Amino acid sequence: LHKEPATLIKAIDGDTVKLMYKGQPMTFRLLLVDTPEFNEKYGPEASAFTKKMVENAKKIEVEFDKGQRTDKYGRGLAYIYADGKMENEALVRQGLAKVAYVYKGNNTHEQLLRKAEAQAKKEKLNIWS
Ligand SMILES: Cc1cn([C@H]2C[C@H](OP(=O)(O)O)[C@@H](COP(=O)(O)O)O2)c(=O)[nH]c1=O
Ligand SMILES: [Ca+2]
């Protein structure tokens, strides 16, 4: 997989973000995770977390997996890095997301995320509390 540039357009919620990619605005959905919706429990915390992460970053990158790059809503499907740190993994590690939506052929970082989920769960963090 390879990291590609993008710039923040705007934070949306825990697992979506509006970024500029190849010079075009796109809503991105974070691969392999599910944050609560803003209205659900930990929804606000997930949203705040991703927002702080992207807004504080000097360098945002997107990394597409092997399979489909856009979902049925036209959202880009990627791993998103903030100053080299993977937001998808960070959310799971903090118990602010679950590993979810693992579809064959877009699952490169599946095991990395499940390991983070196991740690979050051990620590009874947030959603696991
Ligand atoms: C993460 C991801 C979501 N989706 C679609 C599946 C779900 O369909 P449905 O909308 O029909 O439930 C939806 C969940 O996204 P959200 O968790 O953002 O709602 O997004 C994909 O198709 N591929 C993916 O990789
Ligand atoms: Ca969600």
Swiss-Prot record:
Subcellular compartments:
Secreted
The Basic and acidic residues compositionally biased stretches are 109-125
Q: Which residues form a coiled coil?
A: none
What is annotated as the active site?
Answer: 29, 37, 75
Question: Which residues are listed for Ca(2+) binding in this entry?
Answer: 15, 34-35
The ranges of region (Disordered) come to 109-129
What name is this protein filed under?
Answer: Nuclease A
This chain's source organism reads: Staphylococcus aureus
